[PDB]
């Protein structure tokens, strides 16, 4: 029921490093996990991340391991996704999404997920 | 071995150090276990806390009994995590035991001798017997890199620890204290290293 | 020495002049104590008083257990403090028991026989023997600068104080009213000091 | 989390009086320790007192003993710092800090604090 | 008629600067001329400097001459004085006031002057 937006996005060199942020509107977000998607022109939207609702549970994509960090302040109920290693490719729309009303494990799939925010922009130059 | 019947750790402060390390003799992979420990701590109202760190060298998180913030009582086994909401929270010692099954992945959770609703959780998994144990810390690796704002502050005692399921009359056997026969963790036979600011003192709750 | 059993002094009307003096035959000086004692008042929706004061030469403050309005229990030794809060003050005569040790700072508290979690204070800290108790008024000087809004009005009684840190089933005998053998300080076989309005009556609490 | 601010501060002949004040926003102020610290140009701050949290526990510096006076009221919310016998080095800004939501003694560090005030100045002729 | 309320007082190093402001409330103040005066304790008001309507026309005291600078805006309706490379003695309590429902000079006393502000203390070590 959460609604979400994002910010932080933009265009940086190579090398660089964004402090990506989520908001969420609503008073269950402590009950939905979080999850970081990209979506890139001529394609669909692709796993990132995804984060414990509790938070001391978190998942990460191969490419996204060892350089990419996600957290969560309950809080302040807003999600983190600290990403750095800025090269290229990793240049595409990206959209925080999140959809779980009950206790359950990180999933990597599309199908769960209910509910999407508008979507923020990352350029590596 | 040495006899802590009666007894109990003290963690009188907040702090990043202080932390008891436990031993088991398990060499076999675990299909099924359960877990029953009394603790009893004030930071319920304030912040989260680990109860119970059991860790591999592959996942600091094989099983992991933790409390989280205005949530409740949050299991975890082999990277996946279940809660187990609480509405209110009153200042009381507390019993738990905590069971979990892998051909089924049915887990069972007892608080003061009052079960939960049983769920699932990854069903056909195994856990490695190769692991480090430890009270008083939440451990993101195999020999470290603890947090302070997740150590707890108080006591814990009557861990003990099984590779198989108890029914539910052997748990409340347990609850109102008669005699059992541990087997992989025995609080009458245990084993342990502690660092840091940590005590034994004879016991709170009844 | 007098047998103050089954009977307790009384403080009609709040004032800056009544007040009970307690002599100690104390000379080796304490590392470690348990206080118990009983007191009755309906002053908690109210300002705040002192239950005990403990005051060598170099520090009014060694011991004062002391209520804290809106707070709770506030207790405090060699300068230091801790509080003990309370979420609502009911209306009965109320029974309590601290101890602290010198060697690991530990603190226990226990109100009306249930236990409060243990915390830390003053690691290595020593207390002097030669000293003036005062009951009824907090004293900010050795023996005088008796405060009015801090004076208590009401009852105290059983005031019992050992050098050294009793069981958990040592303080359920005392709560129960078992027999026992105070060191520092007997209630039956007390010697005091009266000032002012105060009066021996027998006890309301059971 | 409350939030600090003074008043009381101005210049003065040698040998007068001064009853600063400082002000607290929030609800959790009686849950914290008070204290005043010293600044002057060229250097950093300096502890000067502190106030305990029920109010019965105080703590002054060397030259503040017999001199200075430390209070608190919890109804309104607000610590007060009376001084005497003003000299003229003690002329500087001064600052009203304090952060242990939480229960302990009174220390003589900065570390432990957490929260400041804008600051005011005190200034002798 | 106009409320005057200065700011930018404080304490800093012999040979500092300081572009302390005033604040008028009313709608008159493109009509009165301003002024900025001093003040130590156990003396009276001393004459510092004073600021035109149409602010070309000014007059600064002997010591302040070239020191300092006087101005004024009526957009913001706000006066500013600026003083450069202080010293200890020009520490004292510094008043914005003035008063002119006429047309006149910019005089040097101070009866002619009516509404008076606060003042703010300004120190230099």
């Known amino acids: 029921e959460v609604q979400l937006v994002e910010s932080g996005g933009g265009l940086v060199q190579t090398g660089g490093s964004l402090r990506l942020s989520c908001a969420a509107s609503?008073?269950?977000?402590?009950?939905?996990?979080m999850g970081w998607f990209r979506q890139v022109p001529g394609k669909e939207r692709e796993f990132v991340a995804s984060?414990?609702?509790?938070?001391?549970?978190?998942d990460y994509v191969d490419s996204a391991k060892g350089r990419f960090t996600i957290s969560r302040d309950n809080a302040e109920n807003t999600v983190y996704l600290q990403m750095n290693n800025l090269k290229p490719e990793d240049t595409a729309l990206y959209y925080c999404?999140?959809?779980?009303?009950?206790?359950?494990?990180?999933?990597?799939?599309?199908?769960?997920?209910?509910?999407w925010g508008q979507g923020t922009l990352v350029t590596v130059s | 071995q040495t006899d802590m019947s009666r007894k109990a750790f003290v963690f009188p402060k907040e702090s990043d150090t202080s932390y008891v390390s436990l031993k088991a003799p398990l060499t076999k992979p675990l299909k099924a276990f359960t877990v029953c420990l009394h603790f009893y701590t004030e930071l319920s109202s304030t912040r989260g806390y680990s109860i119970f760190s059991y860790a591999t060298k592959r996942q600091d998180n094989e099983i992991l009994i933790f409390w989280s913030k205005d949530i409740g009582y949050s299991f975890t086994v082999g990277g996946s995590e279940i809660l187990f909401e609480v509405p209110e929270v009153t200042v009381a010692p507390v019993h738990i035991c905590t069971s979990w099954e892998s051909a089924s992945g049915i887990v069972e959770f007892w608080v003061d001798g009052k079960p939960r609703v049983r769920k699932s959780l990854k069903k056909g998994y195994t856990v490695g017997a190769e692991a480090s144990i430890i009270l008083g810390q939440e451990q993101d690796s195999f020999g470290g890199n603890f947090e302070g704002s997740q150590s707890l502050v108080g006591d814990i005692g009557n861990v003990n620890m099984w590779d198989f399921v108890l029914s539910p009359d052997e748990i409340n056997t347990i609850y109102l204290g008669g005699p059992f026969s541990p087997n992989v963790l025995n609080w009458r036979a245990l084993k342990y290293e502690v660092q840091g600011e940590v005590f034994t003192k004879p016991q709170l709750w009844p | 020495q007098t047998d103050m059993s089954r009977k307790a002094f009384v403080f009609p009307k709040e004032s800056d002049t009544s007040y009970v003096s307690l002599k100690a035959p104390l000379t080796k000086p304490l590392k470690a104590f348990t206080v118990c004692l009983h007191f009755y008042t309906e002053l908690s929706s109210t300002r705040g008083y002192s239950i005990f004061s403990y005051a060598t030469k170099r520090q009014d403050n060694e011991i004062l257990i002391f209520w804290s309005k809106d707070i709770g229990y506030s207790f405090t030794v060699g300068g230091s403090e801790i509080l003990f809060e309370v979420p609502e003050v009911t209306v009965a005569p109320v029974h309590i028991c601290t101890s602290w040790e010198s060697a690991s700072g530990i603190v226990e508290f226990w109100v009306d026989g249930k236990p409060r979690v243990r915390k830390s204070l003053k690691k290595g800290y020593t207390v002097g023997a030669e000293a003036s108790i005062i009951l009824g008024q907090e004293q900010d000087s050795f023996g005088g600068n008796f405060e009015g809004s801090q004076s208590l009005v009401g009852d105290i009684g059983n005031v019992n104080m050992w050098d050294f840190v009793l069981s958990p089933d040592e303080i359920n005998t005392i709560y129960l009213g078992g027999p026992f053998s105070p060191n520092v300080l007997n209630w039956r076989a007390l010697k005091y000091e009266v000032q002012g309005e105060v009066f021996t009556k027998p006890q309301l609490w059971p | 989390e409350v939030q600090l601010v003074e008043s009381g501060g101005g210049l003065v002949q040698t040998g007068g009086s001064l009853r600063l004040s400082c002000?607290?926003?929030?609800?959790?102020?009686?849950?914290?320790?008070?204290?005043?610290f010293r600044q002057v140009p060229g250097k950093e701050r300096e502890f000067?007192?502190?106030?305990?949290?029920?109010?019965?526990?105080?703590?002054?510096?060397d030259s503040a003993k017999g001199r200075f006076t430390i209070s608190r009221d919890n109804a309104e919310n607000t610590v007060y710092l009376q001084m005497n016998n003003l000299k003229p080095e003690d002329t500087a800004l001064?600052?009203?800090?304090?952060?242990?939501?939480?229960?302990?003694?009174?220390?003589?560090?900065?570390?432990?604090?957490?929260?400041?005030?804008?600051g005011t100045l005190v200034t002798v002729s | 008629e106009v409320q005057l309320v200065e700011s930018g007082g404080g304490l800093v190093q012999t040979g500092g600067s300081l572009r302390l402001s005033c604040?008028?409330?009313?709608?008159?103040?493109?009509?009165?001329?301003?002024?900025?005066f001093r003040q130590v304790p156990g003396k009276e008001r001393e004459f510092?400097?004073?600021?035109?309507?149409?602010?070309?026309?000014?007059?600064?005291?002997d010591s302040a001459k070239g020191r300092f600078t006087i101005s004024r805006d009526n957009a913001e309706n706000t006066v500013y004085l600026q003083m450069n490379n202080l010293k200890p003695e020009d520490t004292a309590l510094?008043?914005?006031?003035?008063?002119?429902?006429?047309?006149?000079?910019?005089?040097?006393?101070?009866?002619?002057?009516?509404?008076?502000?606060?003042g703010t203390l300004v120190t230099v070590s």
């Open positions: 999404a999140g959809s779980q009303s009950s206790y359950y494990d990180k999933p990597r799939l599309l199908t769960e997920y209910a509910y």
């Open positions: 609503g008073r269950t977000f402590n009950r939905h996990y």
């Open positions: 984060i414990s609702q509790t938070g001391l549970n978190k």
